[PDB]
Amino acid sequence: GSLPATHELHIFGSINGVDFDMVGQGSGNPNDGYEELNLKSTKGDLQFSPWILVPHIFHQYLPYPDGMSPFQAAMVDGSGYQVHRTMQFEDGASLTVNYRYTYEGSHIKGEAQVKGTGFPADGPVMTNSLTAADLGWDSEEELSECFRIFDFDGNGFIDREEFGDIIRLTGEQLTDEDVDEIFGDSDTDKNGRIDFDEFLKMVENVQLTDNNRSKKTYPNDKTIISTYKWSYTTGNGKRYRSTAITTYTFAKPMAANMYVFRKTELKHSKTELNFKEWQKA
Ligand SMILES: [Ca+2]
Ligand SMILES: [Ca+2]
């Protein structure tokens, strides 16, 4: 009958055939979408980047804009759900994370069974050289190429004239004054031109590239499939890209009655990690 306040996780399995096992406890705020979790290895030093466990490491904490998410609803009514998470990486590797949960009041006890295969032995996962994880495939380098296409006069800034052909990329029908408003809001230093730093922020604010799009489909009344593009930052700053497919199976049909803006942080040694997640208000 309760939304969650605390949780624990046992996450274990194998990566490239080598077993791992981690345990720990955390907490969160289901009204705001905040989570924090500590995990410790029980089998010695991790042999792979724990960033690949992100975002997998509790949607019972993650609300919708207008109220409870279906995941929260299924905890509150007791019926629950199970999760089959998959991630397909640009190098052919794959990761499966299967979740089950039990509830004791506002406490969630989670278990995630993991199987990762096909990671190159000398790549950033198996040598622990990832440094961040983010929704979407955009990089600053790819957005630089876009900026340069539309900077017609070549002066290093997007002016109001040049901005029209950029904002078209949303596909939305916008009046001249709709565009004026977006332009003004994007020109945060009020010099009449959009510089590259302002352009990066505009891309996120208007979802020019749909970088934060998270698509849900409902194959049947007990299933949600969430799918999205994902990336990790590597040691030379370049992106390591993947595709996520998460299938939720609910015990009871969901009640008859989009973009994701979350940040993650992971501090990690070989034996312990501290994870935090924040959802934009
Ligand atoms: Ca220009
Ligand atoms: Ca400006």
Residue numbers in the entry: 11 to 67, 70 to 269, 276 to 299
Please share text taken word for word from the publication where this structure appeared:
Here we present high performance ultra-low affinity genetically encoded calcium biosensors named GreenT-ECs. GreenT-ECs combine large fluorescence changes upon calcium binding and binding affinities (Kds) ranging from 0.8 mM to 2.9 mM, making them tuned to calcium concentrations in extracellular organismal fluids. The sensors were constructed by inserting a small fragment of a calcium-binding protein (68 amino acids) into a fluorescent protein. Compared to the GCaMP design, prominent in high-affinity biosensors, our design yielded sensors with fewer calcium binding sites per indicator (2 vs 4) and conserved original N-and C-termini of mNeonGreen for the fusion of subcellular targeting motifs.
To elucidate more details on sensor function and for guidance for our protein engineering efforts, we solved a high-resolution crystal structure of an early variant of the sensor in the calcium-bound state to 1.3 A° resolution. It revealed a structure in which the ß-barrel of mNeonGreen is opened to harbor the minimal calcium-binding domain of TnC. Within the TnC domain, the two EF-hand loops with two bound calcium ions and key regions linking the TnC domain to mNeonGreen are visible. Using structure-guided optimization and extended iterative directed evolution we were able to dramatically enhance fluorescence changes and response behavior of the sensors. The binding affinity was drastically reduced by inserting either an additional aspartic acid after position 168 (GreenT-EC) or a serine after position 204 (GreenT-EC.b) within the EF-hand calcium chelating loops.
